Design an enzyme around this catalytic site. Structure first.
Site, short mmCIF file in Angstrom:
data_model
loop_
_atom_site.label_atom_id
_atom_site.label_comp_id
_atom_site.label_asym_id
_atom_site.label_seq_id
_atom_site.Cartn_x
_atom_site.Cartn_y
_atom_site.Cartn_z
N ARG A 1 0.77 -100.83 -67.69
CA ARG A 1 -0.18 -101.69 -68.06
C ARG A 1 -0.19 -103.27 -67.46
NH1 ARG A 1 -0.68 -105.69 -73.11
NH2 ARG A 1 1.51 -106.24 -72.24
N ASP B 1 6.30 -104.28 -67.25
CA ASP B 1 4.93 -103.73 -67.40
C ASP B 1 5.20 -102.87 -68.30
OD1 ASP B 1 3.43 -104.43 -64.26
OD2 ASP B 1 3.68 -105.81 -66.11
N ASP C 1 5.82 -105.92 -74.08
CA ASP C 1 6.83 -105.17 -73.45
C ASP C 1 8.27 -105.51 -74.11
OD1 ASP C 1 9.11 -105.62 -71.13
OD2 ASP C 1 7.53 -104.02 -70.70
#
EC number: 6.3.3.2
Length: 164
Positions: free
Chosen positions: A115, A154, A124
């Protein structure tokens, strides 16, 4: 393969979407989302998000699907410059592992399901608390998929439901 490259191309295409086009895209995406949940009965509490300008919208029949199967929705509440929590409509807080599934908003995603968020890092950090292997599901338009190198900060996402 630069993130800035993507973020720019995507915000561009998202704003450009016509009211008629967005409607059709969201309808198909919410249709796919429902098709994904229908066979997952152990999902009784689900994390959603508050649709910001241009993001994929959760449609009326999606929420209807939740009411009919008695699935409770929880939303993100920024608690600090680095943390976020999930509370329901009555503001009751739900602990990370009280939630069975997370529908995650994103700016971009690559081939490896990584992402590209809004740079805050909330998700996260939050997602590090899961201990029930809850599904981490991205919601997005097909044009949000790009080619970039993912940083360890990420989220990986198990799947990105999109219009295709």
């Amino acid at each position: 393969m630069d993130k800035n490259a993507l973020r720019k191309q995507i915000l561009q295409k998202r704003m450009a979407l016509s009211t008629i086009e967005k409607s059709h895209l969201d309808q198909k995406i919410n249709q796919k989302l429902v098709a994904f949940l229908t066979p997952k009965p152990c999902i009784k509490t689900i994390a959603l998000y508050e649709p910001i300008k241009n993001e994929v919208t959760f449609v009326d029949f999606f929420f209807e699907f939740l009411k009919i199967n008695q699935i409770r929705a929880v939303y993100p509440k920024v608690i600090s410059d680095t943390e976020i929590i999930f509370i329901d409509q009555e503001t009751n807080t739900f602990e990370p592992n009280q939630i069975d599934c997370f529908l995650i908003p994103l700016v971009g995603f690559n081939k490896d399901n990584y992402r590209l968020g809004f740079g805050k890092g909330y998700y996260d950090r939050y997602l590090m608390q899961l201990t029930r292997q809850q599904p981490k599901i991205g919601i997005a338009y097909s044009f949000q998929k790009g080619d970039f190198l993912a940083d360890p900060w990420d989220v990986q996402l198990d799947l990105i439901i999109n219009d295709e």
